[PDB]
Amino acid sequence: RRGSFVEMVDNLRGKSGQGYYVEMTVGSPPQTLNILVDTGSSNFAVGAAPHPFLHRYYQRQLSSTYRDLRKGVYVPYTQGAWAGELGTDLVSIPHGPNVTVRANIAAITESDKFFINGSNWEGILGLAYAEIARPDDSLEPFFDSLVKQTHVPNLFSLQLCGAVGGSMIIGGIDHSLYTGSLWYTPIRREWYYEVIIVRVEINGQDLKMDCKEYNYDKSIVDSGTTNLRLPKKVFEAAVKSIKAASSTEKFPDGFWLGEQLVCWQAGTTPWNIFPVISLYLMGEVTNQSFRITILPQQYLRPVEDVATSQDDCYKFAISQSSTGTVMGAVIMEGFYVVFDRARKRIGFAVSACHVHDEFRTAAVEGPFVTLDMEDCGYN
Ligand SMILES: C[C@@H](NC(=O)c1cc(-c2nnc([C@](C)(N)Cc3ccccc3)o2)cc(N(C)S(C)(=O)=O)c1)c1ccc(F)cc1
Missing domain, CATH: 2.40.70.10 (Acid Proteases)
Structure with a gap:
C-alpha cells in the first residue's frame, strides 16, 4: 500500500502510441535525453548527430567523462537499424535509482527507419541480456553494469x-x-x-x-x-x-x-x-x-x-x-x-x-x- 519507490512512479511518458521513454542523463556536464525502454534488445544507444526526427542529441565533445572505445557497432532490428560508435560515459536516471554508473553507450550517427517522427525519444535502453548484445556478448548491457557497480x-x-x-x-x-x-x-x-x-x-x-x-x-x-x-x-x-x-x-x-x-x-x-x-x-x-x-x-x-x-x-x-x-x-x-x-x-x-x-x-x-x-x- 505504501511506497518507498514513490519517486520512480510516473517516470515514463509517450507521444501516444509511439514508444514509452524515461529520462536518462549522460556525460559531464549533464546531458539529459528521452530514452525508449526496450526489453527486446540489450544495447544502450543514443542519437549523437542531427536527425529530422530528433529534437536533441548526445554531444560527446561536450562530455569530459566520455571515453571512446574505438569500435563501431551496427544494430538491425525487425523494424529499423542504426550504426554508431562505441564508448562509455557516466549515466544516471533522474527519476530512477539514486546512483550513477559508467555504462557502455553507442553514439548513433546514422539510422534507417529507427527513430519515429513525433515520438519524442532520442535513444534506446536495451534491457535484455548480454547474449544478444551487439557486436557481441562482451559489451556489457546497461542493467548488468548497474547491478555490478551498485547495490540496486x-x-x-x-x-x-x-x-x-x-x-x-x-x-x-x-x-x-x-x-x-x-x-x-x-x-x-x-x-x-x-x-x-x-x-x-x-x-x-x-x-x-x-x-x-x-x-x-x-x-x-x-x-x-x-x-x-x-x-x-x-x-x-x-x-x-x-x-x-x-x-x-x-x-x-x-x-x-x-x-x-x-x-x-x-x-x-x-x-x-x-x-x-x-x-x-x-x-x-x-x-x-x-x-x-x-x-x-x-x-x-x-x-x-x-x-x-x-x-x-x-x-x-x-x-x-x-x-x-x-x-x-x-x-x-x-x-x-x-x-x-x-x-x-x-x-x-x-x-x-x-x-x-x-x-x-x-x-x-x-x-x-x-x-x-x-x-x-x-x-
Ligand atoms: C517504438 C514503437 N515500436 C514500433 O513501432 C515497432 C517496433 C518493432 C520492433 N522490432 N524490434 C524492436 C525492438 C527490439 N523493440 C527495437 C526497436 C525499438 C523502437 C523502434 C524500432 C526497433 O522493435 C516492431 C514493430 N512491429 C513490426 S509491429 C507493427 O508492432 O508488429 C513495431 C512502440 C513501442 C511500444 C509502444 F507502446 C508503441 C510504439
Missing part, C-alpha cells in the same frame, strides 16, 4: 499505461501500480526475456493448437514492440477465431491484416462486440500455469487523431511474425510486469492503469493444471 537489486518492473505514461521501478516493486496477486512465469533462457505460452483462448474457447506452435522459434516480452505478434499458423487461427467471436459486425479482410483502419463516432466504440484473449503461461510449480487476459481496448489501438476530431480510428494490433511470438505493448499495457532477473522469472499482475470498461477488465488468474508444458518450448 537485480530487478525492474514496468507499468505501461496506454490510451500516455507509466512507471519503471528499478530495484523493486511498487504496490500502488497493481491490484490482485502477481503470477510468475520462468524466464526460459537469459538472452531475450523468453517465456513459454502453453495455451491460448479466445472468449474462453481454446485455439486448440499444439503448444509448440505458440512458441515456434521463441516467445519473448518486448516493451519496444507495439503489437502482440504471433507465428504465422497461430496468427491465422487467432484471426479466424476472433472474426467468428465478433460476428455482430463484419470488417474487411485488410482490417485483420492491419492494412485497413475502422473508425467509430467519438465514444461509440462497441468494445463489447470484440472477444477477450487469454494467454496461459508456464508457472513456477510443476504442471501449474496461469493466464493473462487482455481486452479489445489493448489489441485495438487508436491512430493519431486527424486533428482532435469526432472519429476514433483503430488498427488491429495483433500481427504475424516469422521470428516467434512477441508480447509487445498490446500485452504489457494491461498489466504491471515484473522482470525479476535475480529469480529468473517474470511476474504479471492486473495494472492499476490498464484501459477497460464497466463490463470487463484485464485479468491475471490461476492456478490451472497443464501437463507436458516442458514440450512447448522450441529446441
Whole structure:
C-alpha cells in the first residue's frame, strides 16, 4: 500500500502510441535525453548527430567523462537499424535509482527507419541480456553494469499505461501500480526475456493448437514492440477465431491484416462486440500455469487523431511474425510486469492503469493444471 519507490512512479511518458521513454542523463556536464525502454534488445544507444526526427542529441565533445572505445557497432532490428560508435560515459536516471554508473553507450550517427517522427525519444535502453548484445556478448548491457557497480537489486518492473505514461521501478516493486496477486512465469533462457505460452483462448474457447506452435522459434516480452505478434499458423487461427467471436459486425479482410483502419463516432466504440484473449503461461510449480487476459481496448489501438476530431480510428494490433511470438505493448499495457532477473522469472499482475470498461477488465488468474508444458518450448 505504501511506497518507498514513490519517486520512480510516473517516470515514463509517450507521444501516444509511439514508444514509452524515461529520462536518462549522460556525460559531464549533464546531458539529459528521452530514452525508449526496450526489453527486446540489450544495447544502450543514443542519437549523437542531427536527425529530422530528433529534437536533441548526445554531444560527446561536450562530455569530459566520455571515453571512446574505438569500435563501431551496427544494430538491425525487425523494424529499423542504426550504426554508431562505441564508448562509455557516466549515466544516471533522474527519476530512477539514486546512483550513477559508467555504462557502455553507442553514439548513433546514422539510422534507417529507427527513430519515429513525433515520438519524442532520442535513444534506446536495451534491457535484455548480454547474449544478444551487439557486436557481441562482451559489451556489457546497461542493467548488468548497474547491478555490478551498485547495490540496486537485480530487478525492474514496468507499468505501461496506454490510451500516455507509466512507471519503471528499478530495484523493486511498487504496490500502488497493481491490484490482485502477481503470477510468475520462468524466464526460459537469459538472452531475450523468453517465456513459454502453453495455451491460448479466445472468449474462453481454446485455439486448440499444439503448444509448440505458440512458441515456434521463441516467445519473448518486448516493451519496444507495439503489437502482440504471433507465428504465422497461430496468427491465422487467432484471426479466424476472433472474426467468428465478433460476428455482430463484419470488417474487411485488410482490417485483420492491419492494412485497413475502422473508425467509430467519438465514444461509440462497441468494445463489447470484440472477444477477450487469454494467454496461459508456464508457472513456477510443476504442471501449474496461469493466464493473462487482455481486452479489445489493448489489441485495438487508436491512430493519431486527424486533428482532435469526432472519429476514433483503430488498427488491429495483433500481427504475424516469422521470428516467434512477441508480447509487445498490446500485452504489457494491461498489466504491471515484473522482470525479476535475480529469480529468473517474470511476474504479471492486473495494472492499476490498464484501459477497460464497466463490463470487463484485464485479468491475471490461476492456478490451472497443464501437463507436458516442458514440450512447448522450441529446441
Ligand atoms: C517504438 C514503437 N515500436 C514500433 O513501432 C515497432 C517496433 C518493432 C520492433 N522490432 N524490434 C524492436 C525492438 C527490439 N523493440 C527495437 C526497436 C525499438 C523502437 C523502434 C524500432 C526497433 O522493435 C516492431 C514493430 N512491429 C513490426 S509491429 C507493427 O508492432 O508488429 C513495431 C512502440 C513501442 C511500444 C509502444 F507502446 C508503441 C510504439
